[PDB]
Symmetry: C3
Subunit: 241 residues, 3 copies
């Protein structure tokens, strides 16, 4: 094994208070506290009102390729909290360089109270086998407080106690209406001052949605990178044969 998934010391100081790396996956295996995942589910409280998003660092150190897939990112209480977001594309290859994953919990602000959610993700080997996964029906909670802003915050903005909208990347102003780029960049894209979006590897366009493949995937295969492709059971190889 070579997979490492953890929380950085800087993020750790906001959530727990202790400035240290919180290891989740080490050498391709889950941390000792994750074995009894359910006993760990109790020892985890609802995400506080102050914590809006969470930074999860990951990397495949070895020469071995590892693929990830976010199966379900559903909010069970849609009236309070909107479906949780990721600054990474749902399906893709895990980087060999230490990279941060921004897991955003969007509270609507219209209703007060604690809202539940699902975060289902699978990690697979080059052969296409699930090694590390989210144990069946994982439910995590997030506390959302009611906050009213004059006019209302647009494009995933949350109203602060000082009645000022907290605008997200590529947006600014009082209601977050003044945008730099015309379409907002997706899959982890970035808008420069002139405009447009700096597209992540595997995507191109204006919003970074169009994806090219050097090798087309056969027999109901999903392409994510022109290097490697996921194959259904019974079919093996590059083009799934």
């Amino acid at each position: 094994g070579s997979l490492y998934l953890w929380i950085d010391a800087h993020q750790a100081r906001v959530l727990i208070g202790f400035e240290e790396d919180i290891l989740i996956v080490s050498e391709g295996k889950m941390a000792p506290f994750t074995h009894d995942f359910r006993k760990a589910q109790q020892r985890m409280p609802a995400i506080p009102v102050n914590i809006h998003s969470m930074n999860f660092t990951w990397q495949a150190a070895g020469q071995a390729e590892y693929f990830y897939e976010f199966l379900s990112l559903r909010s069970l209480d849609k009236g309070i909290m909107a479906d949780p977001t990721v600054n990474v594309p749902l399906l893709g290859t895990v980087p060999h360089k230490a990279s941060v994953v921004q897991v955003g919990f969007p509270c609507l602000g219209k209703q007060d109270g604690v809202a539940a959610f699902e975060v289902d993700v699978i990690v697979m080997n080059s052969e296409g086998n699930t090694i590390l996964k989210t144990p069946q029906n994982a439910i995590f909670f997030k506390t959302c407080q009611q906050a009213e802003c004059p006019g209302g915050c647009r494009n995933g903005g949350f109203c602060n106690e000082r009645r000022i909208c907290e605008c997200p990347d590529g947006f600014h102003g009082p209601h977050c209406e003044k945008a730099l780029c015309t379409p907002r960049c997706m899959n982890g894209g970035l808008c420069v001052t002139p405009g447009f979006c700096i597209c992540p590897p595997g995507f191109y366009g204006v919003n970074c949605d169009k994806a090219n493949c050097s090798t087309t995937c056969f027999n109901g295969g999903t392409c994510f990178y022109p290097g490697k492709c996921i194959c259904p059971p019974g079919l093996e190889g590059e083009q799934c044969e």
Copy 2:
């Protein structure tokens, strides 16, 4: 070679002032200033009163496994400074992910003056051979100033100039008596708000001391991880045969 041991730029700014990575081990070999280790021992002053602990970053980049062992962490002047500590278990495998090692120098506060210490550590290959090591009888110094606190600081706490105890992880209050978890977490464990300890890989329990092994080590062999085990000279393999 693939071993890299260095000091991070953020730590470097506190000790030297210059914000840059201080490389010690590069590509499995010691840095040019370490060759004449003794000439480097002069150019190193006593650890200042303000610097309480030091952060040492390390990682095995290649597919090759590397094992470390802290042989001796003794304080030669026990009346001034207590034996230096490490937030890592004495024996173990060096991570493939960039990880920080907190080397704490505990000044008792009862006596004023400079105290000497020993930091002996060995780095070994998969075969079990010492490649990188601390050259024979390494003596480093730490300046400790006398500071008196009303009542006295407990559980490795040092009294500040403002007469307030500097409580360590898992402890708080005026004398550091108010603890979250009942036993303090060891080997790099972390206590959550409810309690208990988030155990590091290779340990389990309440204080993270109990260690399990999938393969038992024969002929006087010490187990640290169920994957690999250290074997004495003459015996080679997984179970030491």
Copy 3:
């Protein structure tokens, strides 16, 4: 591929404003915005007066060795801006550990206006073949404002709006005349309080210029590390035969 060249999130916040990793090279291939390098050259403005230097992070994750060579670092407008600098030696091996490259743009302060420059660099494989390179005649710009200091700043120091010289590493005072070490450390060396320079791997001396080689390179070969050596076309191997 295994090469990764990017800009760190902390540096990104100063230049663009968005705190996120700006990927340039991913898995040995250039980022989607770099393909039409010229269209990317327009979307890049002149380096602002406030930004004096830029931090570029890089690393070769795989067991594969990668060599870099800074071919040209020329300032086309020598009257305004002096030739751009790098805290890394021109020719060398790319680290397997995440390391920062300080690209300094030295404005002379004598003249006001925007100055152009060239940054040519090549990345090669173990066989000695250029894989990733700077596309032909790359011209980037830097805005330099006129600032006068009483006496004048020495050893690459730039005068601030408060008329105080911004002294570089190993220098301090009003005109940056008071130096710690007598010769200034080169190739990424560091001067301690007593003096001298902590030499980077592959260099030794007082200024870190003298380089040793365990294997001498034949038929017009340039040595950088005693492990690997660059060979001209027609000759292949360790000693270039």
